[PDB]
């Protein structure tokens, strides 16, 4: 009995696996963060068969469902109750996400106000 | 004021409807006349052939006024002059077709780009299918499908071409405005030939597909279009 | 601003925008104006003709004050005086022909460039050009020499 979105299109993603850095598995100092290979002799850079995939503009998600949560709403980071009331006219498509640094005492008030305003909260029962 | 304005608007709408009906009737009459002309031409060619064969004579048919040319090989490793002629014939992508009227200069250009193209003499059914199924016009430098006769009327109205039938007639029976009609026609992006090819790299005479295949170009169009 | 500078977009590029076949060496062509006659002669002769060689007479103790002589054209002559001075001209039925002191305005020589309006005027200056004097005489003024 949660808050339904205004529209629920079928979210389709071209690729869901994270792009990993070349040779990130072999070494610990190499993070998973993607950096374009810029070597003269690099299989990944020239896209040899059987290598890791280079991110491109082609993998761009559809604008209709871009930044859309699986629930169907778009996140908006809320810090306080005053900022919560902004989503009053956007409750049917935008959902409040309470900031991490917010204390539990204010978090409870934010959750109650969002419940009054019929605004969805993605982390309502978080602190307690 | 209101009733008078409404009556005038209704009168204008009725006039527009009557004009559109008259244009539709003109299109129908032109198409029927074109059908009669095609039947007359086909019958009279056979009549001339039979007339020549009746006595000790032969009837040499006229050299075709237009030809259909399709690029069969890609853009990798192309001589500069061959590439220039291909891009002058509006044949840039592989498996693209374009109607070219035949004369000395056109035949010489086709001879120059002979290994890179397969060309022949298209049939009336081939022209009909190419114009209908894969017919796109160049309007405002944009490739727009010929879904309605309004586009053709707007683009080639100054040339007595107002419908698909007029366009097909001008393409087939090469007239004064064949240049304008062919330039308006976007090059036909034909699909890959179903059933395969004999050999891309050799001439049609020696078992390949390149070169002149005057009558078999119709079979090629049937396999590709 | 380093934020707007180019060096921030070159992070991650090995050669840092200076090529990799030939590295950005310290001084490949020579320091400063090296080789004006050798290996840079083409540039020095196609962009700075007349760089090498002496010409003219030497002047040891040259003073710009001796040769200081600002010039003003007849194109802008009445601008030295107030506009009401020219308003009180071609009027009064007397032929006033006011006096414009060029030296006071800050110029020594009066040149003949430009068109002079049909209004007599007394021009006082250290030096006069022949064409400027002819223009003043044709207008109906008089050239006055001062020291």
């Amino acid at each position: 009995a949660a808050l339904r979105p205004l529209v629920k299109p079928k979210i389709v993603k071209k690729r869901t696996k994270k792009f990993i850095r070349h040779q990130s598995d072999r070494y610990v100092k190499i993070k998973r963060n993607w950096r374009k290979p810029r070597g003269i002799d690099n299989r990944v850079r020239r896209r040899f068969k059987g290598q890791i995939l280079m991110p491109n503009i082609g993998y761009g998600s559809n604008k209709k469902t871009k930044h859309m949560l699986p629930s169907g709403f778009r996140k908006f980071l809320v810090h306080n109750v005053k900022e919560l009331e902004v989503l009053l006219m956007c409750n049917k498509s935008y959902c409040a996400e309470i900031a991490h640094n917010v204390s539990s005492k204010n978090r409870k008030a934010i959750v109650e106000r969002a419940a009054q305003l019929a605004i969805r909260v993605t982390n309502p029962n978080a602190r307690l | 004021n209101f009733a008078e304005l409404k009556i005038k608007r209704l009168r204008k709408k009725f006039a527009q409807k009557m004009l559109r009906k008259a244009r539709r009737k003109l299109i129908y009459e032109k198409a029927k006349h074109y059908h009669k002309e095609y039947r007359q031409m086909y019958r009279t060619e056979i009549r001339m052939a039979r007339m020549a064969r009746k006595a000790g004579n032969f009837y040499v048919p006229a050299e075709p006024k237009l030809a259909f040319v399709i690029r069969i090989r890609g853009i990798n490793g192309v001589s500069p002059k061959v590439r220039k002629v291909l891009q002058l014939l509006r044949l840039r992508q592989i498996f693209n077709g374009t109607f070219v009227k035949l004369n000395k200069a056109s035949i010489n250009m086709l001879r120059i780009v002979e290994p890179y193209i397969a060309w022949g003499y298209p049939n009336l059914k081939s022209v009909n299918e190419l114009i209908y199924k894969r017919g796109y016009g160049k309007i405002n430098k944009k490739r727009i499908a010929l879904t309605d006769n309004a586009l053709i009327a707007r683009s080639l109205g100054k040339y007595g071409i107002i419908c698909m039938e007029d366009l097909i007639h001008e393409i087939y029976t090469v007239g004064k405005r064949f240049k304008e009609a062919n330039n308006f026609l976007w090059p036909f992006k034909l699909s890959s030939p179903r059933g395969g090819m004999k050999k891309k790299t050799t001439h049609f005479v020696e078992g390949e597909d390149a070169g002149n295949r005057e009558d078999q170009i119709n079979r090629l169009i049937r396999r590709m279009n | 601003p380093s934020r707007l500078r180019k060096t921030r977009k070159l992070r991650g590029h090995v050669s840092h925008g200076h090529g990799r076949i030939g590295k950005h060496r310290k001084h490949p062509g020579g320091r400063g104006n090296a080789g004006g006659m050798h290996h840079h002669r083409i540039n020095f002769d196609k962009y700075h003709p007349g760089y090498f060689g002496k010409v003219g007479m030497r002047h040891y103790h040259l003073k710009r004050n001796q040769s200081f002589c600002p010039t003003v054209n007849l194109d802008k002559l009445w601008t030295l005086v107030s506009e009401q001075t020219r308003v009180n001209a071609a009027k009064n039925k007397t032929g006033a022909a006011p006096i414009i002191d060029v030296v006071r305005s800050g110029y020594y020589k009066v040149l003949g460039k430009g068109k002079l309006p049909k209004q007599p005027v007394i021009v006082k200056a250290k030096f006069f050009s022949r064409r400027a004097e002819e223009k003043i005489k044709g207008v109906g003024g008089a050239c006055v020499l001062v020291a």
Binding site: - | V78, R83, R92 | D45, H48, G50, Y51, V55, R86
Partner: protein, 187 residues
């Protein structure tokens, strides 16, 4: 698989002014609407010139505007200048005018108002003649800057009259080998 050279597929013409000032952007919006609605090309030309940079719209002198308005035929027409109108001190008789410009110098403004003329801004010009009827479009000398004197065929080349980049003109800085016939050669 198509051979199309993408070397010059992107046109480099301006679309919006690079200036961040708000009045010019409001005028840009107004003339964008006027150009996209009205069939007159005057609005399009004015919008394109508003898009131009400072060096591309040199100031127009009062004498040049006077001589351009004195031509037979453009009597009682409003002058439209996208640059700025600057006073000319070497002209005495200034007839009354109808000048539309982004800016006018104080001296030129005083001269025009004293002569009995009228000065209008671009919004006032749009209100008066939305399609620019009865307008004379004028601009300053584009090649008037001293920068263009250094452009063209390089010095030290035959039949070239280009000003070279010299630290300071003088006897012993140039006019030597390469310019003197008695020293090597000349061009």
């Amino acid at each position: 698989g198509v051979d199309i050279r993408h070397n010059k597929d992107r046109k480099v013409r301006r679309k919006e002014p690079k200036s961040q000032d708000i009045y010019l952007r409001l005028l840009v919006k107004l003339y964008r609407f006027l150009a996209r609605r009205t069939n007159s090309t005057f609005n399009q030309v004015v919008l394109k010139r508003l898009f131009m940079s400072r060096t591309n719209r040199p100031p127009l002198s009062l004498s040049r505007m006077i001589r351009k308005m004195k031509l037979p035929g453009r009597e009682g027409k409003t002058a439209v200048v996208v640059g700025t109108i600057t006073d000319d001190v070497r002209v005495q008789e200034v007839p009354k005018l109808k000048v539309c410009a982004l800016r006018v110098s104080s001296r030129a403004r005083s001269r025009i108002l004293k002569a009995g003329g009228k000065i209008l801004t671009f919004d006032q010009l749009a209100l008066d003649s939305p399609k620019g009827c009865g307008t004379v479009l004028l601009s300053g000398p584009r090649k008037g800057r001293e920068v263009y004197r250094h452009f063209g065929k390089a010095p030290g080349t035959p039949h070239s009259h280009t000003k070279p980049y010299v630290r300071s003109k003088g006897r012993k800085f140039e006019r030597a080998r390469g310019r003197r016939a008695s020293r090597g050669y000349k061009n």
